[PDB]
Subunit: 384 residues, 4 copies
């Protein structure tokens, strides 16, 4: 008799995540790849994703949104450099240095008033080319800042960076905002004398749809949302056919019950539908209780590489499938999404006088466990 | 200028969890305490909870629902014995032995057909006293089984155990099911000759509301849901006043904006309400986007130990509070629940011919991060 | 074989609505009763409610929120005077007069600039005693206005009126706002010379919890939400024991299937629960598809005046009940609410520079039909 | 100062509904048109729809799902014949006859056991050609039944009818079920001797996608869901380009506030977005409180025939729009649907031993009022 205490789960193939970092490297001819892992790896797991990237050498740094995620990654024996995005308290200086964490330089004032400290602090200089309040938007302030950095050998400039807000939007008003931002980048950086291997310009969207524009430096790319294999444009643009990003995640379940049901028998109590032929029917332990179900098509599932049909009434915790032959209980089932490229995260920003709130959150089956598959998963110790 | 990338979170005080294991030990005069951690520590975090229990010695074993959680706990350097609840595949025998995992004996057939193996396999004998299909419901089968175990010195009997389904229900039909189950336990175990220090009878509800019944052995108690400090009876029974379980979790946020708003000014665009007096108002970065909000009272929050009122219209991501003095941005806020003892998990079971599906899931703000506070948290390396 | 095309419905007893108007008349010793019917009779049906009040003489006027509801009521052969609450366009003057519709005087300017017209225009003078922007808040403007009205015999003053915002709230800050408003009423109306039989002061809450305060005139009461028999205070205050308002509505369904199920048989596919005794079980055609279900207790229903228990798993469209004897299909079932006095409407207001938005909406099973029961229902032609 | 007590509504153009009945008559060369009005006119209003069809002569009968809807229609002075679909109690015989209501003959037994009665009972003979349990599936029973009818001159055969379940589905398995049903119709009706002008074969889907098949009689068509102008196939099939069904309904609102907002100003508190140019912005009194909003695109609305953009954060009750010039408050706004042809009803059926539950319900903004526009609306007295 068998007990199923894990009837559904999100299956995450870490090989495919690695592969995605590898593809987008080749697509952009990038030197360095900085893997952006916000919201616990876009709700897929930052640690396992990070370990997979360290072992395959497919990322050269990791970017995260909170100091406490940097510290946890360090605890998990990640050794790559890590860059935390919105943290720069003078009081955390010791933590940043001791744990080799890169931080963003937010303003000229911040650099001028840097207190004294031991060791090397790795810093990134953010170029406000428009749609943000973080960092530098004046050419004279940037060179003031480059002076303070150069003069101080305890400061190690990790990156001079920006990103384009409208690379993932379609149209004309957006092509022109893109140009405007690229103008500002150049106005703000040309003739400053920056070692050009420090430039980082490309977020996911920039990497995908502007890889042939020579004006964009791919010195250090910063792929985030695209790591999961989704379409970053939310419907607006089509993925380039030549770029082969793999969708890395699936929602899965398993067969909890198999019944031989005969040619005309009723499929369930109260049911409209009868069954077309002698043959087996599987009951899967999900239904309308599962809020994630409403992003899945409800006519088919995948079992054994093949696509068998959903028949009858779905209940709160039961979905039935006509099988092609008999399968044993415990056989894996994979759900199919209405839209394969649909986002798995949502972002919410708010701007106030002295504070910017930037919250990313999962929208993929938040209440079920993440399971890691594939050879890479075995090697990093995440595949039990 | 400050960036808030973590505007809300669930704060989990591990000292209070420890304290709860300690209280319920004294309440039941228990010798051994086995901490039940299903659904990732009842959605609060099994690893940090387990580490807190190992360091304080407040639990002597850990019980979990899936092998893969046992393996992860082992990876996290938990050394206490661990007992996985619904796993007993002969093919996992090696894993169980090598990682010191206790398993349940599900049936006499299973014991008779045990294959050969190396090392000591730790096993638990489950007494079906009624509301379940797992384990032994016949007095002769139990003694058959005790023979096979005794004869085999590689089998180490960890527990002989049951639990009462209706300890957490109120009434007369339920007091009698309780008696019926206790009759079966005794019919099934008296005169079997079991070392009585192996008996485990008490789930959370048994521990709470039947601690004075001498007929219940508290040799090894199995507190699960009560670890979090909630009321396990879902409204039905009142917690004993003398038992002081602490609620261990809170949903928190922080002040994102403070505005001096004057005696009659409008509080927000389109708003019914004006403000009663000269004084400060804080904007908190949550609102109706947050599904967890609907379990919280919307008239007050706690700031600085004190209880300040919510004023005006709550939006999708903004809630406003009249403060007693001025506070700086970043000041912690704690939400207050409509019902402090409300459950933080939901359980769903399904029974089929050859399989039992038992799914527990969090119902507390599944999309936000768990943060660990308190001295114990510092000591186990979970408080960054 | 029988077809159920109306499996659930809201049953509205018009006798009980009448009775409620009658009770609250006696409770307040009121002379005139103006029945407030917003949001289609609080989502219970303004026309049938209005006809029931005309036939029993239990209301002397009707108040509604939109001109178009006044016009419809007129079409339905309601002859009582009707007062539309937020309409006063000079262009609708003809409609108001021809259809005997009372309108509110919103401002002194409006009265001074009244154009010329034929017939008698019935008008109400609203006293802003605080929490509103409609009508008159200055003692000199009121007497200016009484002059213009008196001088013009085509204007017929129907009411001079206000209401108290905090009669339905509990506490000290609210008892004092009540006093403040009552001060303003008196400051604004004493020594103006108004025929006192025109005063209307009491909304539902004023009628219920302040019927013994001699300072409140009950000359013409304006019961609205209380007509349905709910508690207007949303939890805050307890209904006076001596006032016997009847809850007028129920959500009902009917038995769609009866099965003899035997002493141990399984109740449904996949089900935890078996059935306690030989005896009949009814299937009711509602379940979790029905959003209204989440306001109902899910342990019992009423059949035949008696209270039979709900057993087993509720599906999307099926709920099962153990019956005491056998009943025939088509037998009525009545649902029981978690909270009998719970509101059946929600109100949303917004204030802007030149406009006030005041939206009331049903929260009781908006997608199912209203059925009218009782002798009064037969008499007014609404009980088919 | 203006009060908006009706901030949103569903606008229903009755001319367009008439027009749809007219089109589908010409498309199928139909003689008689029976307008199917289930679920209160598909949640758009059966009475106003019926009156519009009587006045324009665009329907020759009306079909509804409940006796009580027939009775109400009669009360509203509809004189066309009415046919109630699942009612045939011998006890209602008097009601059916006195109110000229056609009923379905459900079985040979029912006809044989007809009791004695006065007047003419109009009856319809339903041919079970497959997917139903109502009516006749045997050739000998049909001729038995035609004998009993012919012999009795108080029975007036109104229709001999069926419909095709898979006319609104796409594919091969469905083209063949269609053929199978058409085979059964013919097997069951040819050589029976029925006056062929009594045949009714075509539901909405049959009318739309099979109008050129000569094997289908369009003697009396039964258009239901298509009356509203939606796509009956739910995505599966494309409407024929030559058939010009009009969508008859809109969700509307109105401008509650207009603000001159200047070239860079912030659009709302906490807001990411600033405004591109000097110019006016309207606030509309809907937002995420409105569950219907989630079927509407949130980038544009229609004002004055033109399409102006939605800018900024939508709140619970506020949506903002950049206008092309200044408009006055009270100006109508029309929402645009993600999918113009999307269904406005959902149907749920359940089959049990002695009963069939067939529930249709609105899915279009159930809590807001239906407003009727157009010249036809004026003429039938529904446009106030």
């Amino acid at each position: 008799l068998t007990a199923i205490h894990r009837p559904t789960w999100v299956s995450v193939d870490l090989d495919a995540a690695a592969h995605n970092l590898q593809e987008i490297r080749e697509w952009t001819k990038a030197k360095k790849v900085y893997a952006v892992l916000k919201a616990d790896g876009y709700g897929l797991g930052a640690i396992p994703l990070a370990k997979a990237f360290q072992e395959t050498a497919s990322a050269d740094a990791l970017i995260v949104s909170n100091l406490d995620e940097a510290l946890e990654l360090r605890q998990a024996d990640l050794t790559l450099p890590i860059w935390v995005l919105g943290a720069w308290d003078y009081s955390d200086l010791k933590l940043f240095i001791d744990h080799d964490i890169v931080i963003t330089i937010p303003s000229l004032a911040w650099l001028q008033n840097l207190p004294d400290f031991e060791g090397t602090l790795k810093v990134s200089l953010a170029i406000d080319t428009g749609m943000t309040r973080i960092g530098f938007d004046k050419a004279d302030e940037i060179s003031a800042a480059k002076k303070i950095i150069d003069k101080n050998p305890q400061l190690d400039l990790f990156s001079v960076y920006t990103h384009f807000a409208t690379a993932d939007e379609a149209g004309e008003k957006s092509k022109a905002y893109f140009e405007e931002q690229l103008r500002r980048w150049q106005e703000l950086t040309i003739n400053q004398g920056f070692d050009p291997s420090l430039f980082s310009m490309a977020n996911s969207a920039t990497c995908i749809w502007h890889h042939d524009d020579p004006r964009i430096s791919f010195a250090a790319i910063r792929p985030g949302q695209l790591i999961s294999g989704v379409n970053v444009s939310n419907g607006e643009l089509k993925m380039p056919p030549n770029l082969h990003l793999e969708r890395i995640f699936s929602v899965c379940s398993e067969i909890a019950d198999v019944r031989f049901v005969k040619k005309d028998q009723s499929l369930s109590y109260g049911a409209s539908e009868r069954m077309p032929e002698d043959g087996y029917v599987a009951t899967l332990p999900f239904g309308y209780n599962d809020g994630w179900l409403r992003r899945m098509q409800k006519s088919s599932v995948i079992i054994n590489g093949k696509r068998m049909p959903i028949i009858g009434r779905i209940t709160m915790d039961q979905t039935m499938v006509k099988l092609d032959r008999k399968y044993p209980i415990g056989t894996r089932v994979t759900l199919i999404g209405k839209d394969g490229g649909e986002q798995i995260t949502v972002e919410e920003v708010a701007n106030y006088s002295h504070t910017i709130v930037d919250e990313i959150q999962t929208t993929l089956a938040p209440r079920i466990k993440r399971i890691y598959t594939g050879d890479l998963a075995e090697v990093i110790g995440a595949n039990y």
